[PDB]
A = this chain, B = another copy of it.
Amino acid sequence: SNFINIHVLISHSPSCLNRDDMNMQKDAIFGGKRRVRISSQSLKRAMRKSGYYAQNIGESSLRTIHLAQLRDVLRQKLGERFDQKIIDKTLALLSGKSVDEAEKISADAVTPWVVGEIAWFCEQVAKAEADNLDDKKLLKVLKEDIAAIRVNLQQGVDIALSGRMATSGMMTELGKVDGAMSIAHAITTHQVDQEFSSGVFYRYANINLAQLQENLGGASREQALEIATHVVHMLATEVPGDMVMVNFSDMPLSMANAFEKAVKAKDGFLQPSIQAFNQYWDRVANGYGLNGAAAQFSLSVKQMPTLEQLKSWVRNNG
């Protein structure tokens, strides 16, 4: 199977998580009732900026629209390895914006950058320069091996996970990346307006294994399964400012509809949420005849003793 579905049932405070322009906690209507919400882009930045990410996956991506302070940074980082000329030409051709000594140069939009990837382009611009390669022809030569460019996204894995959009310059054909990870917005499983209870949020995400391999320049399934495990951890632990389920499938599957009918419980939401998740899962796998490799870690379908075991089970496929 090519899809690995991650089902996290984390539990914490429904307050002070994600704000809007009115500094209020984000929400959403589901099943006709209000749920506290944390946006998918909130989760993703929380992950790639966390220490766990830096320790297990690597360096995050430089996301900027200011190309003028950027052209400083690559000069002051690729100073030795490349000529000051080439280091500017590369950025210009890449973004389409003619580079200058301007201190104000803006791209079309905020795009993630990878220093390693840019350093690679310089090498090709270098061979261009020496062998004379009129940029139009150079573009053709580079179009032949996108895979030899996607490899440099091992430096910027968050890109390969969440994709990149480009509408200007040479990045239009060479830089377009379709994200390998699809992630839902985290929502509570219950109505947020009996005893006081913490919030129980359902989180969902999946990873297109083949796409992730492709986005990394043809990495092995083992390498992709590794990144997948790190994602499972971050999605199950990290909180902006319990129960984990993982299954393999040919087509993505969310369990959000388990909580379509909001969970009601006079003294604690986690336990009926887990039951609701289990009840729905049984009905879906039965009705749609799904037999993919599944594994569930829960202290209350191969059960797992800890998160780390599940985290290792995933790394061994099923």
Contact = CB atoms under 8 A, between A and B. Distances in A.
Most chain B beta-carbon contacts within 10 A, residue among A31, A52, A271 = A31
A261 B251 contact: no
A262 interface: yes
A13 B188 CA distance: 12
Contacts of A268: 31-32, 260-262
A98 interface: no
A269 interface: yes
B288 A29 contact: no
B286 A307 contact: no
Nearest to A204: B13
Interface string A238-269: 00001000000011001011001110110111
A269 B265 contact: no
B286 A257 contact: no
Interface string A275-306: 00000100110111100000001010000011
A107 interface: no
Contacts of A270: 31, 257, 260-261
Contacts of A283: 299
A14 interface: yes
Contacts of A297: 287
Contacts of A196: 28
B306 A289 contact: yes
Nearest to A31: B268
Contacts of A271: 261
Nearest to A284: B299
A82 to B, nearest CB: 29
A301 to B, nearest CB: 17
Contact of A287 (B251, B256, B299): B299
A129 to B, nearest CB: 30
Interface string A195-208: 01110000010000
Interface of A: 11, 13-14, 28-33, 37, 51-52, 184-185, 187, 190, 193, 196-198, 204, 237, 242, 250-251, 254, 256-257, 260-262, 264-265, 267-271, 280, 283-284, 286-289, 297, 299, 305-308
14 contacts: A11-B260, A13-B256, A14-B185, A29-B198, A30-B198, A31-B265, A31-B270, A32-B264, A32-B268, A33-B265, A242-B257, A257-B270, A287-B299, A288-B306
